[PDB]
Amino acid sequence: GLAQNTLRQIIKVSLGGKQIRMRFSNLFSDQPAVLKSVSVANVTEAPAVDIKTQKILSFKGSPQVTLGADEVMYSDAFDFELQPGQLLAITIHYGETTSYILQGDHINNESFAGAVKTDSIMGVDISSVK
């Protein structure tokens, strides 16, 4: 269980570009996942990020999205300073490879201090656009 919490995943991008898109797949299956808010930002150290580059994602215009079992869904296209070989952070707040869980909403939390570190949980990946 992890609903009503906030998970921040750190990934390794191998493709740079100006305009990117985010893949979302329900890895953790069974029940659906309600994504209250998603953000993408650059990584400084540890789980700490930088909001001055953070971008909040939208899904068909809506900032929230629900992902049933065996479902994949991409975010809307957003401008981002992506570089080949960079550290990327994706923070997701839910509602009823390193990864960091905090209780409650922590979309605007740089430090993520006091975070745990799990063993993934949700399939994320960068993807091209039109």
Numbering used by the authors: 41 to 136, 149 to 171, 175 to 185
Give passages from the manuscript.
Acetyl xylan esterases (AcXE) that target mono- or doubly acetylated Xylp are well characterized; however, the previously studied AcXE from Flavobacterium johnsoniae (FjoAcXE) was the first to remove the acetyl group from 2-O-MeGlcpA-3-O-acetyl-substituted Xylp units, yet structural characteristics of these enzymes remain unspecified. All homologs were confirmed to release acetate from 2-O-MeGlcpA-3-O-acetyl-substituted xylan, and the crystal structures point to key structural elements that might serve as defining features of this unclassified carbohydrate esterase family. Enzymes comprised two domains: N-terminal CBM domain and a C-terminal SGNH domain. In FjoAcXE and all studied homologs, the sequence motif around the catalytic serine is Gly-Asn-Ser-Ile (GNSI), which differs from other SGNH hydrolases.
We successfully solved the structure of the CBM-like domain of FjoAcXE (to resolution 2.45 Å) and multiple structures of the full-length CspAcXE and PbeAcXE enzymes. The construct of FjoAcXE that successfully crystallized did not include the first 36 amino acids that comprise the CBM; residues 37–40 and residues 137–148 were also disordered in the structure. Due to the incomplete FjoAcXE CBM structure, further analysis will focus on the PbeAcXE and CspAcXE structures, although based on our analysis in subsequent sections, we expect that these regions would participate in the active site, i.e., Lys34 and Arg148 of FjoAcXE. The CBM-like domains of FjoAcXE, PbeAcXE and CspAcXE adopted a similar structure. Based on the protein sequence of FjoAcXE, the CBM-like domains do not clearly group with the existing CBM families. CBM-like domains share structural similarity to several types of β-structures, including CBM1 and CBM35. However, the CBM-like domains of FjoAcXE-like AcXEs do not clearly group with existing CBM families.
